[PDB]
Paper text:
The P9-1 protein from MRCV (hereafter, P9-1) localizes in viroplasms of plant and insect hosts and, when expressed alone, self-interacts giving rise to cytoplasmic viroplasm-like structures (VLS). In addition, P9-1 binds single-stranded nucleic acids in a sequence-independent manner and has ATPase activity. Using an integrative structural approach, the C-arm was found to be dispensable for P9-1 dimer assembly but essential for the formation of pentamers and hexamers of dimers (decamers and dodecamers), which favored RNA binding. The multimeric structures of P9-1, resembling the ring-like shape of hexameric helicases, and its ATPase and RNA binding activities suggest that this protein participates in the equimolar copackaging of the viral genome.
The careful analysis of the recorded data clearly exposed doughnut-shaped (torus topology) pentamers of homodimers (10-mer D5 symmetry) and hexamers of homodimers (12-mer D6 symmetry), representing 80 to 85% and 15 to 20% of the particle populations, respectively. The global resolutions for each species were 4.7 Å (decamer) and 6.8 Å (dodecamer) based on the “gold standard” criterion (Fourier shell correlation [FSC] = 0.143), with local resolutions ranging from 2.5 to 4.5 Å (decamer) and from 5.5 to 9.5 Å (dodecamer). The doughnut-shaped P9-1 structures reveal dimensions of 12.5 nm × 12.5 nm × 8.5 nm and 14.0 nm × 14.0 nm × 8.5 nm in the decameric and dodecameric assemblies, respectively. The full-length dimers are settled in a parallel mode related by the respective 5-fold and 6-fold rotational symmetry axes holding their C-arm protrusions as staplers, as previously reported for the octameric arrangement of the RBSDV P9-1 crystal structure. In this way, the C-arm of subunit A interacts with the neighboring (−1) dimer, while the C-arm of subunit B interacts with the other-side (+1) dimer. Interestingly, as a result of the loop orientations, the pore is more occluded in the decamer than in the dodecamer (middle and right). We found a marked ability of P9-1 to bind phosphate moieties in the three multimeric states, with a strong preference for the decamer. Remarkably, a significant binding probability was found on top and around the C-arm region, which was again enhanced in the decameric form. In this regard, the crowding effect within the pore that takes place in the decamer would promote the interaction between both sites, as additional and stronger phosphate binding sites were predicted by in silico simulations. This finding gives a potential functional advantage for the decamer over the dodecamer, which may be endorsed by the cryo-EM and SAXS experimental data, where the decameric assembly was the most represented species.
Residue numbers in the entry:
A (entry chain E), B (entry chain D), C (entry chain C), D (entry chain B): 5 to 19, 44 to 70, 74 to 107, 111 to 130, 155 to 228, 238 to 264, 269 to 337
The structure:
């Protein structure tokens, strides 16, 4: 049941709306367990250390997830969610509700205080997700679709955000890619090339803005990304699911048969 | 937009029930206009005179349909329907309701009184539909499906009925095929072979029974086919439709592009 | 209130749909108590040791059921259910929810470690159910019905599965019988004979497949039987009930009377 | 599709209420057409001239019905209804509403003015219906039912009324039978014998009463029968229908087969 890495899938519904399969839910869940690429749902020549870095990040995410797995009840669905710009995962577990900030880059006054092995773990993680996005876009170019003009990249925004955030906290392409989550596929397929210009000054002084609302019952902090267009965007949650693939097998071994052989009457 | 002759198609719906595309509605409609196989929605080596007999029958059905087309109003949907055993088509036309018995074989006391050219027209028609069913079943054998165990032949019953009716009014396979409209596909795919045994006596004395109910508002005649199992079946209407294929085109000319070529950052 | 062994019954409902009576719910319940054939709801000449093996299996199932009966509360309906391929029963009990795997054949690394008396108990059980199915099919042949073309064998699939599973873990007929749970009655009545052909190679390497879905809240294992058609099928639950027969007695002793005897006026 | 004369049938419905089939709707409809007993839905030794008188009455009713059939439109369901004590039938006919008093005995000041052939026609009719009721009751005695205690004779009241009306206008049994339309079947089956006593005086002075209500929009006449109990009853309409028997045939010719003959594995 393998599939190419960085993939997407397209599903039909009608009473003919299409929907996208992410390639995200599975990646997160695999990273939870430290599963290695060999025993994964996933021809990667131009992907150096794809399994190598992949498994390193799998391991790193595995212990990090275990860090909060310890407190979890045995008894206490799965609706994983992500938040920009520290790129935090969100989980729940019921009887029959926590988070973990995988890549906190908002504020880190421990540049040398944080050990270098941990730093390498994050660097592997970000490399994995970045070239993951690269594979996703090359896959986009590979096999187009009727519905290429029907949906947008909007899912993948925060990952690009984390990309450029690290880049500045160590580009134009990934930046402007993030700039328009509403941007459509076949568009990129046509004009991926010249998307280059703000030039220096709106990002020399912080890539993003932070504003907190004193809602008198809490302090709703919020991040406002800044785009090459010279604009801003609210960062927002996007809870995920994963479609429950049904249990159908395959015709694979069915014995096809001839009919002229049978003495059909005429 | 060609397709193989005698074809079927499989469509998914969910809130994953499959549905069948007949290869019947289109055939009837084509036969209405006398359209020739060249300009039809349809690799036919083992199908002798397929286009030849096909177009002969197209012509014959075209005039026959015109016989009642004349009375039709300009102004006065399409929900074509069929009745066994004289294999009659049923039409309607509204402002914004008739029939024609294509192959009346119940009673014909004009064996030589009916002209031989008309007889040849019907013989071409029945040959066309018979080898049509042959193509349908060979197509069944060709490409199986997950859903081969989910539906039955029930649509095609009356055609087989007409087949054997002509045969007797000039076999075991087509007969027993008709005998169980509820019969499933992949079943036939497995045990098409030995379906041979009633032996002579229930069909020497008429293949079918006729019973009329004096409903005091009419005389509902009805035909009761007799099957190799030694049983009977009510013959019933089955109104047809045809799914309205949407207007989507194709990725056909889309320019796929490379990505390692673009100076992606890493 | 006796009935023939391996029986079935047919019931009408309308606002004229028929329904089947299994001969399964009762068999299971009888086997629960170790009840002997004499004091059962059940002319068995061709059924050697029918009561003998029947009562042996009744005893074996009785202790096996008692094995989990012990934990049951006094206070804590009946909706018995079965699962292939280890052929497990499923029970519940409420105040006003367990199982037992009668014939676990999926994995048994105790071929000589399991005592021979237990093995004989299972062998008696499987013999009982197998010739039970034999009686069911001979009964099918005996008295046909209007509705023989209206339903399928689908209920009895897992039992046949267990049959062939034991056979391989010690045939074509019972195998192919299982292969199409959707297979219709009067069909079998006609073509029971030649249903023989995969030939060796798809079953030399395991009769079935096992696939588990890591649903992130559990590990849904599932079994995928392989059929002579060269295909697969999901194994599925089928919860049972039993119709509550009403309390009507009989005209049995009613005194029929003459009327010409009474001095009717004319 | 024959059945015994004067018959009844019992049908089940549940969400196990039984319903009765009359043997009345059919009799009326047959009498409408003058159909003869040979070509009717109907072992009559104790029924002298059953077909003879039956066909005489069939003829008489046929012309009488034709008397009003003449005015009927071609275009202008069937819900035949009956009224005591002149025992009048009630019909309707729509595009997609009359009556006829078969046996007017309320007032006839033409005792010799009415021709004797017409009189013989009515006498045949009344004999037919009377011994019809006789057959119905002997059939009741013949085959009892679980539901014999669930319904009453109420349908057949007016016919008995006409019987005794003629008798007086030329008994105890048929009289008292009519007296309690609510009377139950198996009751009669037990105590048919001694139902004999008003003695002369309430019927010497008219068997019935007539009362008309001047409803200021019409004159609703009504008849009030008098019973051996010394009581009265309103005479009332009872519109009829007839259940639409479905089109199912028969297993009649099905080939039952052996199973020990087939080389079943064990």
């Amino acid at each position: 049941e393998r599939r190419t890495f960085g993939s997407y899938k397209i599903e039909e519904i009608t009473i003919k709306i299409p929907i996208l399969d992410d390639g995200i839910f599975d990646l997160i869940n695999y990273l939870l367990n430290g599963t290695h690429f060999d025993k994964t749902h996933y021809d990667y020549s131009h992907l150096p250390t794809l399994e190598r870095d992949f498994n390193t990040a799998s391991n790193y995410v595995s212990e990090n997830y275990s860090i909060i797995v310890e407190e979890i009840d045995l008894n206490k669905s799965e609706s994983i969610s992500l938040k920009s710009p520290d790129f935090t995962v969100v989980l729940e577990y019921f009887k029959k509700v926590r988070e973990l900030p995988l890549l906190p880059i908002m504020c880190r006054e421990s540049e040398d205080s944080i050990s270098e092995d941990i730093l390498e773990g994050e660097g592997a993680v970000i490399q994995v997700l970045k070239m993951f996005m690269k594979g996703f876009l090359v896959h986009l170019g590979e096999n187009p679709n009727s519905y290429d003009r029907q949906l947008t990249i909007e899912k993948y925004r925060p990952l690009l955000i984390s990309i450029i955030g690290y880049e500045f906290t160590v580009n134009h392409i990934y930046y402007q890619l993030a700039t328009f989550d509403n941007y459509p596929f076949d568009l990129l397929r046509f004009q991926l090339q010249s998307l280059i210009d703000i030039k220096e000054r709106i990002e020399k002084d912080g890539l993003f803005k932070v504003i907190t609302t004193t809602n008198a019952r809490g302090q709703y902090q919020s991040v406002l990304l800044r785009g090459i267009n010279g604009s801003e965007s609210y960062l927002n949650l996007k809870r995920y699911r994963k479609f429950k693939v049904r249990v159908v097998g395959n015709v694979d071994n069915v014995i096809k048969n001839d009919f002229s052989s049978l003495k059909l009457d005429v």
